[PDB]
């Protein structure tokens, strides 16, 4: 009860108006601060115990940031637009050794979001669903998080069908990009742990904290 897509859209609009890997990691550290502000604007998130808020954000930050820059890049040709105002071209990612994962982002996320014209409200809800991940280990009350997630997709479905009555399978199409987002997010973490291990690639404090155990 009470999870209006209007509040979710507002959260979205409130937070967003040489080694490409280094530039991407810097943009990620910058956006981690903005991610906290976004979450705080998602209905009921701030009312959950502090430890569960931490758990949810540590569990979903990478997928949450990937979803955001991917949607921001729908207008971009063959690349992504970073929050720092910088653009990373597919050729540049390839020349830095991260071409495979970069292409997965363009192919499975950006292109698909562009193909269906995913809007900001839909993106917001999908992110709110990722945020409210009931499977997150350590949760003091997973049922509570599960209930919030259900309220989000219930509101998302109503939004769809009311806004896109001509596309009965839109709601399902949106949810079905989540497994790709999960797989891509996991691969990105692997790369990040490697960069950290190797020593090259400066990693800022907030991004570094997210890579800390557990």
């Amino acid at each position: 009860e009470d999870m209006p897509v209007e509040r979710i859209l507002e959260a979205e609009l409130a937070v967003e108006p040489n080694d490409p890997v280094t530039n991407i990691c810097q943009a990620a550290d910058k956006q981690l601060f903005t991610l906290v502000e976004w979450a705080k604007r998602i209905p009921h998130f701030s009312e959950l115990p502090l430890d569960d808020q931490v758990i949810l954000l540590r569990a979903g930050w990478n997928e949450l940031l990937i979803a955001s820059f991917s949607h921001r890049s729908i207008a971009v040709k063959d690349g992504i637009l970073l929050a720092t105002g910088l653009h990373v071209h597919r050729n540049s990612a390839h020349s830095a050794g991260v071409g495979a994962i970069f292409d997965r982002v363009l192919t499975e996320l950006v292109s698909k979001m562009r193909d269906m014209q995913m809007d900001k409200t839909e993106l917001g809800c999908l992110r709110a669903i990722v945020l409210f991940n009931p499977d997150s280990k350590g949760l003091s009350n997973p049922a509570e998080v599960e209930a919030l997630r259900e309220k989000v997709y219930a509101s998302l479905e109503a939004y769809c069908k009311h806004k896109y009555p001509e596309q009965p399978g839109r709601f399902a199409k949106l949810l079905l990009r989540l497994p790709a987002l999960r797989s891509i997010g996991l691969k990105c973490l692997e790369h990040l742990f490697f960069f950290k291990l190797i020593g090259d690639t400066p990693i800022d404090t907030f991004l570094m904290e997210m890579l800390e155990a557990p």
């Binding site: 601060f33 906290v36 705080k40 502090l50 808020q53 931490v54 954000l57 540590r58 404090t205 907030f206 904290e209 997210m210 800390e212």
Partner: peptide
């Protein structure tokens, strides 16, 4: 643990 995240969420 997780100094930054806790601080940012509390404020």
């Amino acid at each position: 643990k997780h100094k930054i995240l806790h601080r940012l969420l509390q404020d």
